[model samples]
Target chain A: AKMKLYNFWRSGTSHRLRIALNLKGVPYEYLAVHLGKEEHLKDAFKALNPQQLVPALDTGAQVLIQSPAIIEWLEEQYPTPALLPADADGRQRVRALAAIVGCDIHPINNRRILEYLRKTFGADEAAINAWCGTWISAGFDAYEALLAVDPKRGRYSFGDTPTLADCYLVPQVESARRFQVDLTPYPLIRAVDAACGELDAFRRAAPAAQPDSA
Target chain B: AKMKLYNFWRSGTSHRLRIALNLKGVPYEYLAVHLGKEEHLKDAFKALNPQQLVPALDTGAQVLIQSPAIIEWLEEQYPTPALLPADADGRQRVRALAAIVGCDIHPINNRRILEYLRKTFGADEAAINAWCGTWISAGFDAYEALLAVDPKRGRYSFGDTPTLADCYLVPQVESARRFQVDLTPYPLIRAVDAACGELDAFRRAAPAAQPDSA
Candidate 1:
């Protein structure tokens, strides 16, 4: 049986997984779990992934949750394309760049947290967007700064080709634009996003291209 | 020359890094960046880490940021007494467990976000505490559920030895206790925390044992 990926189209986690899979030339059956309708909170999904989060990959043997782990697994399991660099130092740099988005930005702005803000703090659309923008901006500023100083940085986050960081960063840039964040401050980040945009791997994994984009 | 860890005492990211380093038997000078006094936001720190985050390790070669990246690098570089399991599957499981805390829990409850809650939305102590509790409970619930069902589970998040997952979880558990989130619901998580507490590496890495702990 082929691997199945349970995910929502617009989820940053899901987006990263798609990018990673596409980049690795790996194929999977897309199983949509509608976070918009709280389908992830249901027991059925919980049984597959106790975290009840989207982007869990069922790779015959076990169900893997968490995009970072799954992405790293894709890199290791499918080493041909090489999502990370050969040297530990280069890998560390790429992983750190990915971490800025994977850890610092995306989680804080997940659907559940946004709804929590709405219900708890009575955060209006404006407030919610601002909340999202704050984290995205903070993360992007740091990402851009790192890109500026990185001697190995090429068309992508690591080198001439896209790596794990770009997989993470592209989704974040998409979300930032959705939140109406000013990308003008981070030209290097904008450049990488644009660079990644030109790739078929990235383009095919876009939210709009997903099976359940609506 | 000893590596210098630039970090704050009580930061969960820093705590996790300390645990990973201790687990690897790597020695480092403790360079405290007082988050409370906004030292992380200063220009000097920015020059060291563009992310302006704690737990940046200066390994004499270069400064490495992001606990997840740095920890993974440590596992790869040191290789002895591996913080990850040898199998790719086991490494995926451990990294997923760590991500539940590293990405999902910690960033939402960071000082900056909490302070923003206070200033932007007038969140008082009680409200802020409740906000912190929600994410902790959510992340821990999933973590505990994963631990409960894993056939390979032992004293730690993965197996008998402390993996990178335990390094991340122990700190989050400590922070959860400080927030007064009820741990009664998750006996397995509590058990893992207790098991790790018995280790000298974990105990030594505790925030209270750090030089900057107030």
Candidate 2:
């Protein structure tokens, strides 16, 4: 295999990379590290990714943590389908759109941070859910507004073809739904999510379809 | 000017972009977005970046939001004094190191999030500071451990030359210190911070040196 992905079924970040791999038609072996079982925290797993996070890729050349980093490496190494735009400006816009989901929304509401919120603040389930909704809505608001106004936006975030923005957007929408977030306001985001959902790559890489899904 | 930066002084994300621009020797007009006065919330600023965040770059081509995205664009447009490594594997390593701070640490503790904690959880100043320290230390722990084990580490995060990793790491160390985090625990992080500080580009881009710093 050209790649080995350390992943968890329910991890949104993992889902992002999985979708990217599927879209690129790249072959890889899946190795599940159960986050619920604290497998990622074990010394052996920790040796692979010091962050103890999923979506770590062993590319046979180097180990890569961080979903964006892994995706970028894949884009550089295999520039076939073109996940990013060729123009510098277009690439910047696509990445910025992706970051809205990856950095602004997902990181704040992810399992670890939510768990931290629960432990540190003694936040109940409802409170944590609301907290998740808040960040997601904030980021989606920005994303929706951007896509709404931008002339370049089409079926995807940037153009007629799905780019890196769609990779981050779809998984984040999945997460938003899980958190019971209301997606009614972000029509642009919801529309893009719907469009991506129709694709074979996005469908195959979904959480329920993963081998380790409970 | 070839660039115009929408920024606030104390913004960690803004600091990341500033360092990248300075390192690349790209000159830009800095427009202060006073986050303290709700200037970022204004309609005019929101027009430029729907994200309403600092470190939005107008590269005379397109408006770019998100620090990592903007930095990557800068690296692409201005390949001289490259912020990313030339090789694919090295680029992956540098980006992974950068994401440790950019995605993992800084986003969780940024101003908007701390404000959310305060408003929603009724967390006081001390609790907020402690919350900030917790994420910073968690990220730094992984970062320190990685650097300690990797044979590639040198004066900077990856090599003697500053890469995208240093852009993120230095700002995050600034953030950790601002929250009164104890740096004694991670000598590697502190050492990298010190090495980056010695550079003129980093010094010029420090938070205190920005036009809007109070």
Candidate 3:
């Protein structure tokens, strides 16, 4: 199937979809969106996705927007090597874990929001980074608690497999590491992240490894 | 099984759980936490949920935090009146639609975020409300577009069922209305919300109906 991903190289959402596609051995063309300059705001691009977000996938049948949605869609479209767990409860666990990072942790640290803080509220980059770290730490702390108590967990978010949680985890862990938000609190996340780092999909999808990185 | 929900009345995350529960006809206790006076920040509340957020549920065995996770858990534990569509692609579509609100819209506009913006960045109510309105507009516009193209949508988010998207959508629509966002741009969302609003679960779970409301 001919697949085209309209993506921004630095975007965590794009990173997630790319890694999912790579892991699933799905081939696709990468159409880059320059988020740094707000090129996504261009009239032509907004028509494709009015939200102007990265990681919109044109999958011949339909163009999917929202990274979590796109990734889940991919999982459904191609069920082999399942990104979610086998049982229903386990699937919810995986999605919930993924949502902690995808929903709670990342949105606040986004470029648009940070820019809003700086331009409208006069916050410095340092202040924004600090804000990012606080939320990350809070999230990771909860994650650590969940993983420690969870009987299903192993080297990964769920039983050492590369489930949906890892797709969301690696990016936030990288951001946490970058912001220096002590991972001592989240040994499970650290361990699972290490396991994911060993995989080719994650290694290739790292922000530093992206084509657009300086 | 005796289920209990630890929730904050005005919480979007907790709100998501109520929708899922009502759809599935699960009888669960509601444990309200007053977030306004730093009740959620208390050590005891933190112990119940290290995340210190609402919509956490006690499943007679364990406690779960995060609204998406809570909703998914409810669906898994109580499978009748399915909250997801039958097909994998359809399920992904619903999840993705829900994630647009859960992951994209709510986190950026939640009460704590607004409070943080005030404390750390000195944003007054007007600026904070503006920030909330902007993200809501961006998200609802996308919802409107997605529903416009969706062949399955009817009175609900997908094919007349209260799937995950409706679970996420109802709260967001309520919040958007509270912010007085110009809903003229998103007719489909308005229509779907109107359908959802008629349901007793959503009606009872409305913020005004909560015990803690002034």
Per lDDT, the best of the predicted structures is 1
Clashes counted in candidate 3 amount to: 0
Q: What pairs collide in candidate 1?
A: none
Interface RMSD of structure candidate 2 (Å): 0.9
Candidate 1 lDDT, A1-214, residue by residue in tens: 7899999888888999999999999999999999889999999998898888888999877788899999998898899898999999999999999999999999989898999899999999999999999999999989998898878678999889899999999999999989999999999999999999999999999999999987
User: lDDT tens digits, residues A116-212, model 3?
Assistant: 8888888887887788898898888888887887885778898867988888888888778777787887777888888999999888887777667
lDDT of 2 by residue, B63-160 (tens): 77888888888898889897887888788888888888888888899888889889988899999988888888889999998889779778999877
Residue lDDT tens for model 2, A144-198: 8889877867898888899989999999999999989998898888888899999
Per-candidate Cα RMSD to the true structure, in Å, reads 1.0, 1.4, 2.0
lDDT of 1 by residue, B1-214 (tens): 6799999888899999999999889999999999989999999999999878898999997899999999999999999888999898888889899999999999999999999999999999999889999999999989988898888778889988889999999999999988889899989989999999999999999999989888
Instruction: Give the clash total for candidate 1.
Output: 0
Which stretches in model 3 have alpha-carbon errors above 4 Å? none
Candidate 2 docking category? high
Count of backbone clashes, every candidate in sequence: 0, 0, 0
lDDT of 3 by residue, B122-177 (tens): 88878877898989988888788778887756788888777888878988888887
Give me the runs in candidate 1 sitting further than 4 Å from their true place.
Answer: none
> For model 2, what is the error of residue B66's alpha carbon versus the real structure, in angstroms, after optimal superposition?
1.3
